[PDB]
Each structure stands twice: as C-alpha cells, then as structure tokens.
Amino acid sequence: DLTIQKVESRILDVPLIRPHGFATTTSTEQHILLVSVHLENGVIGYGEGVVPGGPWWGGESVETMKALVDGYLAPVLIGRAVSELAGIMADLERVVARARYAKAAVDVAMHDAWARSLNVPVRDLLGGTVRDKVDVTWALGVLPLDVAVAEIEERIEEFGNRSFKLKMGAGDPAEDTRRVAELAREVGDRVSLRIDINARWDRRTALHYLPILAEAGVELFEQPTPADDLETLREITRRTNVSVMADESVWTPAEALAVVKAQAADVIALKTTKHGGLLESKKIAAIAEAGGLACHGATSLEGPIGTAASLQFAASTKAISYGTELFGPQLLKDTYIVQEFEYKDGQVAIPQGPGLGVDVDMDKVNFYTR
C-alpha cells in the first residue's frame, strides 16, 4: 500500500533573474533534477538533485545525478515501502558509493511521499518543530562594486536581510579584495558581511589578503581555500581572528568529524542536498553540535522543492544555530511550486502543510523540463 511503484527524474532548467557569477563560472539559469517517488496509494513525493550551477562545485551535475538516480539508485526503492526509508538509504551505499547530491534527491522524495501519506509536514518525521521561521542571509554572486552596493541597499529596504554573503574568486585577488573591502566600508556598519571564495584561492593568497578583509569588517570567511586543506582554514583564523565556515570541506559526517578534530571552522554550511539527504544532514548537525560548531542553513541554490526540504530540516534542528541562506526561490525568475514563500523582515516562514509544505505545478514543471 505504502509501496514505491515508480521513481522518475526530470531535468529542469529555470532562468535566474540576474546572472549569478561564481569564482570560475557564471549561471544565468539553475539546473534541477526534480526526482519523484510514486507510491501505490497514489501519493507523489518530490526531491531535488541540484548543485550550485554546475559540476565545477563538486563534480556532480544534473546529468551525472540522473544517470545515477535512474540507472542505480531508483531501482533499489521499487517494490519497497517508503516507511523503510532508513533501510533503503543504507542499501543505496551497496550500489553507489559517494554521489551524495544524487542520493539527497532520493532521500527527500521519500520523506515527502511518506509525510504526505501520513498527512504531516516533513519535519514531523525529523523530530517536530523547534522554530517556524529562520533568518536568511542574502548572497550576491560576483558583482562590480557599484552593482553590489546597489543590490544590498535594495535588499535591505525590500526584504530586510540583516546579513549579506559576497562571492569572490574571479580574477585578480588584489582587486577582488579591494572590491569587497570597499563595499564593506559602505555597508559594514548596517549589516553582517561574509564572503565565500568556493575554495578557489590558494593558501598563500588567502593568508595574504584575508587580513585586509578582516580589517575592513568582514566577519566570516567561507571556504576561501581548497576543501582538503583543513590546516589552512585553521591557520587563516589564527592569523586573522575571524571565523571560517566550512562548505566544500564538509559533505559527510566523517568530514564533519575531521573539521572538529582539526579545529578548522567555527561554522559548518549544512545543506540537505550536499549531505545526501535529511538523514545524513541530522548526522552532520549532531557532530557539529557536539564539537561546539555552529551550523548554518546553507543552500546549494535549491529550487522551491529543495529549499522547502531544507526549511523543514531547519524547523526541526536546534543545532542550525547560525541562521540560513535559503533564498534559492528568490533567485529564480520563475517557479513551479504553486504556493509562494514568505520572505519578510530578513526571514522566511517555514512552509506549513503536509509533505514539504508546498506542491508542484506540473504545468511549469513540464514547461521547464529539458
């Protein structure tokens, strides 16, 4: 009855309102692998296979995830009750190692299908509610000084964001630094400024310039250097006294443990997609919390479905103690979720209702399908 009859995966290409530039690429649209789990009782659960723009972030892409979901992961679920969630996730490991991003979609789809079948929010399968609204940090892709300052002013006045994250890593380090430092002198008094270089600066470059950003008021350095170099993340804090947030360095529980042991970061960017599901995400939080490391409700620039899965997680996870950056839906020029999220006064309310708390619009899903 609660059996899984079928699992489908659709690649969706949705355009962004503005070009979102990273250290080495620029997105004009997000690619989302919308995965669905179809249960015998007719209910359909949805999950997202999504990374920030492309495989430049970590090696997985919508194409890569569909090949894995379709050809290896999905076939494991078929013929089993969705109420075997934990056991199925464990069996996925036997057919596909790593590939957490692909797995996260299967996990979320199963949670949705199950929570709707039981007629409850997805968070009630994750411990209940701790909060009904979270803070949201607004991230700006790489933008010229004037454009950035302008976008911050607009955001402050229209959405109330009290914190902003500035992506870096494109072009010359000395100029990139100047760009951010200057922007900090014009905004650092009204809001909390953080940066993120997506591991595209080498250790020497980070240790040389980050001090300049620290003096300018930047309060948080997200993954400025390579994911594997935990000693360097620790060293940049030693020399600048400003917190570091690990992102590409932490995908798995084992990697969260490694950061704890290396005292490599004050904060961990927790993303339900990158960790390979809501179950894995709970593990990241447990480890971080035990080592005294704060967790941020981070985003892989998920669409409405993915963002809703992450908000349900934040709603039930006390260890998400450093707000979030779950603004994905806002970056999209259009959606496919029927309902709308409520972003006001620097926050966003948790989606009330069964499943993720938001339903898909099959017309728009079909419209944006590749």
Give just the sign of the alpha carbon dihedral 140, 295, 322, 349: positive
Regarding 150 and contact with a copy of itself (CB under 8 A), the answer is: no
Given 66, 103, 165, 167, which residue is catalytic?
167
Question: Which tokens is 81 given?
Answer: 């009750």
275 binds, among a copy of itself, Mg ion, none (CB under 5 to 8 A by kind): none
Cα dihedral: 79, 80, 82, 83 (round 10):
160
User: Residues 41, 1: contact at Cβ < 8 Å?
Assistant: yes
The pairing of strands 294-297 and 347-349 is: unpaired
Torsion, Cα 306 360 8 64, to 10 degrees, reads -30
Q: Which is nearer to a copy of itself, 204 or 318 (CB)?
A: 318
Residue 247 touches Mg ion, criterion: CB under 5 A: yes
Residue 196 interacts with Mg ion (CB under 5 A): yes or no: yes
Q: Minimal distance in Å, beta carbon 139 to Mg ion?
A: 8
Residue 256 three-state SS: helix
Nearer to a copy of itself, 98 or 162 (CB): 98
Q: Is 222 within any annotated ligand binding site?
A: yes
Minimal distance, residue 279 CB to a copy of itself, in Å: 6
Instruction: Tell me if 217 sits within 8 A of 239, measured CB to CB.
Output: no
**Residue ranges in 273-312 that form contacts with a copy of itself under rule CB under 8 A:** 279, 282-283, 286-287, 289-291
Is 231 annotated in a binding site? The answer is no
For residue 284, give the amino acid letter.
I
Contact between 112 and 122 (Cβ < 8 Å)? yes
In whole angstroms, the minimum distance from the beta carbon of 165 to Mg ion comes to 8
Nearer to Mg ion, 155 or 271 (CB): 271
Q: Which entry of Mg ion, a copy of itself, none binds 196, CB below 5 to 8 A by partner kind?
A: Mg ion
Q: How many whole angstroms separate alpha carbon 69 and alpha carbon 32?
A: 13
Is 208 in contact with 224 (CB distance < 8 Å)?
Answer: no
- Find out whether 345 is annotated in a ligand binding site: no
Q: Strand 192-196 and strand 163-167: pairing?
A: parallel
- In the complex, minimum distance from the CB of residue 130 to a copy of itself, in angstroms, rounded to a whole number: 4
- The count of chain residues that interact with a copy of itself, using the rule CB under 8 A, is 37
Q: Are 279 and 268 in contact (CB under 8 A)?
A: no
Residue 82 interacting with a copy of itself (CB under 8 A): yes
User: Could you tell which of a copy of itself, Mg ion, none binds residue 220, using a CB distance below 5 to 8 A set by kind?
Assistant: none
- Restricted to residues 119-178, the positions that interact with Mg ion (CB under 5 A) are none
Does residue 102 contact residue 73 with C-beta atoms inside 8 Å? yes
Q: How is residue 98 written in tokens?
A: 């790593």
Residue 128: contacted member of a copy of itself, Mg ion, none (CB under 5 to 8 Å, by partner type): a copy of itself
What lies within 8 Å, CB to CB, of 260 at 6+ separation is 287, 288, 290, 291, 293
Place of tokens 């076939």: 75
Q: Site map for a copy of itself, 112-131, x if CB under 8 A?
A: --x---x-x---xxxxxxxx
Minimum distance from CB of 245 to Mg ion (Å)? 8
Number of Cβ atoms within 10 Å of the Cβ of 193? 22
> Does 325 participate in catalysis according to the annotation?
yes
Q: Rank residues 20 and 123 by Cβ distance to Mg ion and give the closer one.
A: 20
φ and ψ at 142, to 5 degrees? -65, 120
Rounded distance between C-alpha atoms, residue 235 and residue 239, angstroms? 6
Buried b (16+ CB within 10 A) or exposed e, 301-337: bbbbbbbbbbbbbbbbbebbebbbbbbbbbbbeebbb
Which of residues 288 and 326 has its CB atom nearest to a copy of itself in the complex? 288
Could you say whether residue 361 binds a copy of itself (CB under 8 A)? no
- Work out what residue 293 binds among Mg ion, a copy of itself, none; the CB cut-off runs from 5 to 8 Å by kind: none
Q: Per CB under 5 A, which region of 3-11, 59-67, 206-214, 243-251 contacts Mg ion?
A: 243-251
Q: Which residues are annotated as a binding site?
A: 196, 222, 247-248
Residue ranges of the annotated binding site for Mg(2+) are 196, 222, 247-248
Q: Which residues are catalytic, by number?
A: 167, 325
Question: For binding to a copy of itself (CB under 8 A), which residues are involved?
Answer: 82-88, 90, 114, 118, 120, 124-131, 252-254, 256-257, 260-261, 279, 282-283, 286-287, 289-291, 316-318
